[PDB]
Each structure stands twice: as structure tokens, then as C-alpha cells.
Design an enzyme around this catalytic site. Sequence first.
Site, PDB file in Angstrom:
ATOM      1  N   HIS A 225       0.727  -1.260   0.000  1.00 42.78           N
ATOM      2  CA  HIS A 225       0.000   0.000   0.000  1.00 42.78           C
ATOM      3  C   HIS A 225       0.754   1.307   0.000  1.00 42.78           C
ATOM      4  O   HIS A 225       0.120   2.355   0.081  1.00 42.78           O
ATOM      5  CB  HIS A 225      -0.968   0.012   1.181  1.00 42.78           C
ATOM      6  CG  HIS A 225      -1.748  -1.257   1.335  1.00 42.78           C
ATOM      7  ND1 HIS A 225      -2.785  -1.599   0.495  1.00 42.78           N
ATOM      8  CD2 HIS A 225      -1.632  -2.274   2.222  1.00 42.78           C
ATOM      9  CE1 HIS A 225      -3.276  -2.771   0.856  1.00 42.78           C
ATOM     10  NE2 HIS A 225      -2.594  -3.202   1.901  1.00 42.78           N
TER      11      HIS A 225
ATOM     12  N   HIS B 176      -1.750  -3.324   8.367  1.00 40.96           N
ATOM     13  CA  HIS B 176      -2.883  -3.693   7.531  1.00 40.96           C
ATOM     14  C   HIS B 176      -3.684  -2.457   7.137  1.00 40.96           C
ATOM     15  O   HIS B 176      -3.847  -1.537   7.935  1.00 40.96           O
ATOM     16  CB  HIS B 176      -3.738  -4.708   8.323  1.00 40.96           C
ATOM     17  CG  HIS B 176      -5.195  -4.717   7.977  1.00 40.96           C
ATOM     18  ND1 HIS B 176      -5.715  -5.490   6.959  1.00 40.96           N
ATOM     19  CD2 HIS B 176      -6.256  -4.105   8.560  1.00 40.96           C
ATOM     20  CE1 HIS B 176      -7.030  -5.353   6.928  1.00 40.96           C
ATOM     21  NE2 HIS B 176      -7.384  -4.520   7.890  1.00 40.96           N
TER      22      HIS B 176
HETATM   23  N1  LIG Z   1      -7.039  -5.293  13.081  1.00 36.70           N
HETATM   24  C1  LIG Z   1      -6.038  -5.901  12.462  1.00 36.70           C
HETATM   25  N2  LIG Z   1      -4.749  -5.821  13.012  1.00 36.70           N
HETATM   26  C2  LIG Z   1      -3.686  -6.447  12.384  1.00 36.70           C
HETATM   27  N3  LIG Z   1      -3.735  -7.187  11.209  1.00 36.70           N
HETATM   28  C3  LIG Z   1      -5.042  -7.249  10.684  1.00 36.70           C
HETATM   29  C4  LIG Z   1      -6.219  -6.647  11.238  1.00 36.70           C
HETATM   30  N4  LIG Z   1      -7.333  -6.914  10.457  1.00 36.70           N
HETATM   31  C5  LIG Z   1      -6.861  -7.650   9.469  1.00 36.70           C
HETATM   32  N5  LIG Z   1      -5.493  -7.905   9.519  1.00 36.70           N
HETATM   33  C6  LIG Z   1      -4.646  -8.703   8.566  1.00 36.70           C
HETATM   34  O1  LIG Z   1      -3.349  -8.088   8.347  1.00 36.70           O
HETATM   35  C7  LIG Z   1      -2.901  -8.412   6.976  1.00 36.70           C
HETATM   36  C8  LIG Z   1      -2.643  -7.044   6.256  1.00 36.70           C
HETATM   37  O2  LIG Z   1      -2.993  -7.084   4.848  1.00 36.70           O
HETATM   38  P1  LIG Z   1      -4.032  -6.061   4.075  1.00 36.70           P
HETATM   39  O3  LIG Z   1      -3.312  -4.770   4.293  1.00 36.70           O
HETATM   40  O4  LIG Z   1      -3.892  -6.641   2.709  1.00 36.70           O
HETATM   41  O5  LIG Z   1      -5.247  -6.358   4.833  1.00 36.70           O
HETATM   42  C9  LIG Z   1      -4.051  -9.291   6.380  1.00 36.70           C
HETATM   43  O6  LIG Z   1      -3.796 -10.732   6.582  1.00 36.70           O
HETATM   44  P2  LIG Z   1      -3.183 -11.825   5.562  1.00 36.70           P
HETATM   45  O7  LIG Z   1      -2.260 -10.943   4.780  1.00 36.70           O
HETATM   46  O8  LIG Z   1      -2.597 -12.730   6.572  1.00 36.70           O
HETATM   47  O9  LIG Z   1      -4.472 -12.178   4.879  1.00 36.70           O
HETATM   48  C10 LIG Z   1      -5.248  -8.787   7.147  1.00 36.70           C
HETATM   49  O10 LIG Z   1      -6.442  -9.557   7.032  1.00 36.70           O
END
Ligand SMILES: Nc1ncnc2c1ncn2[C@@H]1O[C@H](COP(=O)(O)O)[C@@H](OP(=O)(O)O)[C@H]1O
Length: 135
Positions: free
Chosen positions: A16, A130
Site C-alpha cells: 500500500h 494492515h
Molecule cells: N485489526 C487488524 N490488526 C492487524 N492485522 C489485521 C487486522 N485486520 C486484518 N489484519 C490482517 O493483516 C494483513 C494485512 O494485509 P491487508 O493490508 O492486505 O489487509 C491481512 O492478513 P493476511 O495478509 O494474513 O491475509 C489482514 O487480514
Amino acid sequence: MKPPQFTWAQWFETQHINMTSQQCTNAMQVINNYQRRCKNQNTFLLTTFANVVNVCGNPNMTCPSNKTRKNCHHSGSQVPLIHCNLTTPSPQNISNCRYAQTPANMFYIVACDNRDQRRDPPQYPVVPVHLDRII
Ligand SMILES: Nc1ncnc2c1ncn2[C@@H]1O[C@H](COP(=O)(O)O)[C@@H](OP(=O)(O)O)[C@H]1O
């Protein structure tokens, strides 16, 4: 689902923040080549890593994507961003995947956590891990 060589913060940056090309098709090859699949949708924030880390300093809020999570933070200001959408999928040849690019100016909500003690640089104790939403 991130390759093993990256910490969540480094993967967040890869997905991102570091848009290696202003064209989504080329920018997505990096993500796709790393996760071995052509991601259907992905947003690149036209902002700096330092800017996002500071947003991690904004008040904690519930993550729109996960009501059980309180590690999210709202940007407070709108930022230009590019949303990439899969237009031509190729589950047998990733580098052939084509995407559309959609420019916009919106807020973002990021989930942040303490850095990977072993692999994340000590410079940033708290890092985005994330991209929860773009509003
Ligand atoms: N509240 C949160 N805190 C930390 N990580 C989170 C989160 N909610 C979701 N994630 C996960 O953190 C990763 C970040 O990727 P994105 O930015 O593409 O969501 C994703 O998992 P995976 O990559 O294991 O599916 C996502 O689903």
C-alpha cells in the site's frame, strides 16, 4: 498471506505505499509475484511511510473490517490514492495479469502494531500492518 521474508510492516509498505509504477498492471506484478496469485483488488496510498506511522499515533478505533479489533487508526486527512482492480486474470501465468487504475482522494483506516522485534527497524516502534479501509 505475505512472503516469509517480510514483516507485516514491510508487507504493508510493499502493498500500500511503494507503488513501483503509476500504472496498476506493473505495480501489481510486484505484489502478485510475491504472493503467487493475482490479487483481485489493492489500494496504493499516495503518502509516505512516515505519514502512515504518524496516523498510527491517532486515537485507536474499531476496525471497520473487524469489530473485534481496536488497533485501527483513522487518517484524519484525505489522501490521493490509486485503487487497482483485476481486469485480466491468469492463474497459470501471473505476470500476464492486467489491472485497471482508479484515482481518488479518501481517508484511510490502518491497523497498527508494535514492530517485529527481530526484523523491523528500531526507528519505528509502532508500524502499520494492515490497510483496513478507505472511506
Ligand atoms: N485489526 C487488524 N490488526 C492487524 N492485522 C489485521 C487486522 N485486520 C486484518 N489484519 C490482517 O493483516 C494483513 C494485512 O494485509 P491487508 O493490508 O492486505 O489487509 C491481512 O492478513 P493476511 O495478509 O494474513 O491475509 C489482514 O487480514
